[PDB]
Structure formats: structure tokens, C-alpha cells
DNA sequence: GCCTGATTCTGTTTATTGCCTCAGAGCGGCGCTGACGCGTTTTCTGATGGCA
DNA sequence: TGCCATCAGAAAACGCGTCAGCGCCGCTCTGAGGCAATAAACAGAATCAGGC
């Protein structure tokens, strides 16, 4: 349901389980939850570093 | 909270806090509904973080967690079972066995029916995966009734159907393998089964009931200890309006019981009305209950 | 080039199936004992009514 | 369907009396248990697409 307010995404539950379950298992499997690997190389003087 | 089955299979457990204790002879209401033939089997009152065993019709034990059962209201009748537990096609589930944890290296008691014991380490049910474990090598027609945890050396009692009580030293039975099938421990006679299975710790008073609601109370000092495969004593006068026995459970002072027939009509009261008699003596009424109705539950309830 | 999720091996662990024992469990006969029938107390459990 | 009299009728202890099942001897034998072989699962590596 993204307008041009912002970004806006629904999932509805069923009604015989937990919201907090699903969202756990939701940031466990997708891709809610991601890595970042930092590695800082650049030229200095013409040389990597 | 209150876990309920069905014949065919229907589990179902509700909050302990919707009913309310009445008086004595009260009628009660209803918990469930019951399908057009159906009539339910046990009743279990468990807190939800706890281990539950399952011991099937053929001798197969299964592990699970009480929260994972469904949950419903009164007015629903609950899901198959079949879809928990990787059963066989007529197989059912006649025991469970709440454990908190597993530590030490105390032993499961088991009995059947037709009068077996045996004894086994709990050490080996530490872990089970999806497919079960050949717990009893059980013989024709012959169904677990029930199980219980117990120290290296305590006290067990055995009731039959017909009012007839048997103690004796655990120090008898010896520890087994799984597979195994068990020696004698009461001496039946013609067309009686066993019902209940009590070990006694410290003080305390002994409650039983009837098919009808009818029960009493006694002292656990007057009942004698003999040795095992022997006849029992005169545990309640059957007579006529009481009917058969249907179990027995030691219940001390300032606790709370639940009773439930065939089809629902729960009901909890106290344990102070019931007064205190002897051995060979008939009780007093319990349950109201109506016409072709039979009680065939019985819990204790602390606070 | 780097990080992750998904599919495919590979060694380990566990439940189940036969064979043959002996040692513990069960059966038969005997003395003797506890546990179950007897009336009077008694309190106590149902029935009845004020309805609430 | 739940709180108070108010009952009568009768369930239930208790000091005797006996015989019906206990313990305790003998003996006999069938089932746990040790031992070995199979066959599944379980869990950990190892590899392979995919996206910047």
C-alpha cells in the first residue's frame, strides 16, 4: 500500500497465532535482516592500502 | 491449564481461571462439544512450560510441549491429533505424564491393566525424535491406565473396579529394559480392572469416587502393607447407587478437585465439605449428575 | 571478489532384528493369623421452606 | 441456581468371634540379557548459484 506518503507494506496473521512469532521468524529467514561487510582499501600515493 | 480428549482425537486446553468452584451438590456446565457419537476419554490439568509423554495403544512413547496443543474456546470441539503426532491408523494415546525436567536418575513406574508393573530409568527418555520408542511389550487387549515418577525406594497403591486396594514395597519390582513386558503386582479376579495408580508422599488424605458422584475420605495411616501379587481389602462398599470405582488421587487439606462425566458437565469444589471415614464405608453424593451420565474424570487442583 | 542461502555427500549414532542361555519368577502344600460379620449410640446427611 | 432453621432416618464406630488368604518351604522352566549384524535417520562438511 506504498503512496506518495511513504512506504507501507501489510501482512495480517491468522487468528489463532502470535504476531511477535511471526515477525521473529520473518527477520530470521528474509531478507528484513541483512550484513554489511566493511573493508577499507584505497589508493594512497598510487599504491592500494 | 485444562487439557481434554475426545474418542476419535480432539485436543483442546482452555485458561483454568474461566470456571469457579461451587458448592457440593451442584449440577455444573458444560465445557465442550461432543459430536453426534462421541463421548471423551481423560482430563489434565498441566501449566503450559511443561514436558508431556504420550504412550500410545501399541507401546510407542512421544515427547511434547503443552503450548504447542491447539486453543479453542468451550464452544469448539478442537482439531485431530493425528496432525501433532506421526500416529498409525488406529492407534490412540491413553497416558500422559507431565515432567518438569529431566534430572537424577529417578525411575518411571508403569502399570497396565490385568495387574503388570514394570520400572524403568527415566535417563533413556531424555531425548526422542519424530518417531516414537518401544516402551512395553504389551500383551492381547491389555492398555496402559498409568504412570508416574518415584525415588529409589517409595510406596505404590493399585485400585481395581470392584474396591479392592493393594500396597507393597517398590523394592520388589527391579529395574528392566525397554523391551520387556513385567511381572504381577495384584491378583485379580473375574472381570476387573485396574483404574488408578497412587504413590503416597508424607501425610496426607486419601479421596476416591464413584460412576454415580459418589466419594469420601479417609486416612492413608489405616491402609496395611503386605507384599505384592496378593489380594487387596475392601477400598469402598460398591453397593448399588455408587456403581463401580473410577479413581482415586491423594488430596490434602485447602485443595480444590475437578470431576467430569461423558459429555462436559464440569465442575470444582472444595475438599473441606467431604468428611472423614473408615475403610468399608459408603460416601456421600459429589456430582447431581443426570440419568445415563457416568464420571470418568478426576483431577487434583493446589493454589 | 565476497557473503549468503540451498542442495548433495559422508561419517556417526540409534532402533530393530535373530540365538542361546541360565537365574529369577512362578506353582503346590501347610499354620496361622488378621480382616471381615454383629446393635447400640449420634451426629450427621438429606429433604423443606423463607425465597434471593 | 445460592444463603439461613428444621428436622426425622439412618449411615457408622466398637468389643467379640472365626476361617480364607498370607508367608514359607520345596521344585521347575520360560523370558530378560548378552552378543552380533542391518538399516535407517542426524548432523556436519562440501559445493554451487545469485547479487552487487
Same mark, same amino acid.
Given at each position: 500500500e506504498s503512496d506518495k506518503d511513504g512506504m507501507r507494506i501489510v501482512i495480517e496473521v491468522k487468528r489463532d497465532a502470535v504476531g511477535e512469532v511471526v515477525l521473529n521468524n520473518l527477520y530470521s529467514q528474509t531478507q528484513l535482516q541483512v550484513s554489511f561487510g566493511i573493508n577499507m582499501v584505497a589508493l594512497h600515493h598510487g599504491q592500494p592500502k | 491449564?485444562?487439557?481434554?480428549?475426545?474418542?476419535?482425537?480432539?485436543?483442546?486446553?482452555?485458561?483454568?481461571?474461566?470456571?469457579?468452584?461451587?458448592?457440593?451438590?451442584?449440577?455444573?456446565?458444560? /465445557?465442550? =462439544?461432543?459430536?453426534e457419537e462421541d463421548? @471423551?476419554?481423560? &482430563? #489434565?490439568?498441566?501449566?503450559?512450560?511443561?514436558? +508431556?509423554?504420550?504412550?500410545?495403544?501399541r507401546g510407542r512413547v512421544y515427547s511434547m510441549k503443552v503450548y504447542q496443543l491447539?486453543? /479453542?474456546? =468451550?464452544?469448539?470441539?478442537?482439531?485431530? @491429533?493425528?496432525? &501433532? #503426532?506421526?500416529?498409525?491408523?488406529?492407534?490412540? +494415546?491413553?497416558?500422559?505424564?507431565?515432567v518438569t525436567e529431566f534430572e537424577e536418575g529417578v525411575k518411571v513406574f508403569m502399570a497396565t491393566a490385568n495387574g503388570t508393573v514394570k520400572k524403568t530409568v527415566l535417563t533413556e527418555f531424555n531425548r526422542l525424535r519424530t518417531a516414537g520408542k518401544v516402551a512395553i511389550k504389551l500383551v492381547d487387549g491389555d492398555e496402559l491406565i498409568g504412570?508416574?515418577?518415584?525415588?529409589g525406594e517409595d510406596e505404590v497403591m493399585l485400585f481395581s473396579?470392584?474396591?479392592?486396594?493393594?500396597?507393597?514395597?517398590?523394592?520388589?519390582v527391579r529395574a528392566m529394559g525397554c523391551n520387556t513386558t513385567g511381572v504381577r503386582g495384584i491378583r485379580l479376579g473375574e472381570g476387573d480392572k485396574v483404574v488408578s495408580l497412587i504413590v503416597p508422599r508424607g501425610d496426607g488424605a486419601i479421596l476416591t469416587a464413584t460412576q454415580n458422584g459418589y466419594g469420601?475420605?479417609?486416612?492413608?495411616?489405616?491402609?496395611?502393607?503386605?507384599?505384592?501379587?496378593?489380594?487387596?481389602?475392601?477400598?469402598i462398599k460398591v453397593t448399588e447407587r455408587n456403581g463401580l470405582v473410577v479413581g482415586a488421587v491423594q488430596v490434602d487439606d485447602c485443595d480444590q478437585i475437578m470431576m467430569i462425566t461423558d459429555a462436559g458437565?464440569?465442575?470444582?469444589?472444595?475438599?473441606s465439605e467431604i468428611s472423614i471415614v473408615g475403610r468399608n464405608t459408603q460416601g456421600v453424593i459429589l456430582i447431581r449428575t443426570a440419568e445415563d451420565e457416568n464420571v470418568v474424570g478426576l483431577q487434583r487442583v493446589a493454589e
Open positions: - | 491449564v485444562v487439557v481434554t480428549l475426545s474418542h476419535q482425537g480432539y485436543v483442546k486446553y482452555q485458561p483454568l481461571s474461566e470456571y469457579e468452584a461451587q458448592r457440593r451438590g451442584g449440577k455444573g456446565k458444560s /465445557a465442550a =462439544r461432543i459430536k463421548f @471423551i476419554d481423560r &482430563l #489434565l490439568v498441566a501449566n503450559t512450560h511443561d514436558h +508431556i509423554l504420550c504412550f500410545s495403544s491447539p486453543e /479453542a474456546t =468451550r464452544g469448539a470441539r478442537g482439531r485431530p @491429533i493425528v496432525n &501433532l #503426532l506421526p500416529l498409525e491408523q488406529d492407534e490412540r +494415546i491413553t497416558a500422559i505424564l507431565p504412570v508416574d515418577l518415584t525415588s473396579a470392584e474396591g479392592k486396594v493393594v500396597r507393597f514395597k517398590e523394592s520388589s469420601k475420605r479417609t486416612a492413608v495411616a489405616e491402609y496395611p502393607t503386605k507384599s505384592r501379587a496378593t489380594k487387596g481389602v475392601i477400598s458437565t464440569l465442575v470444582r469444589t472444595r475438599v
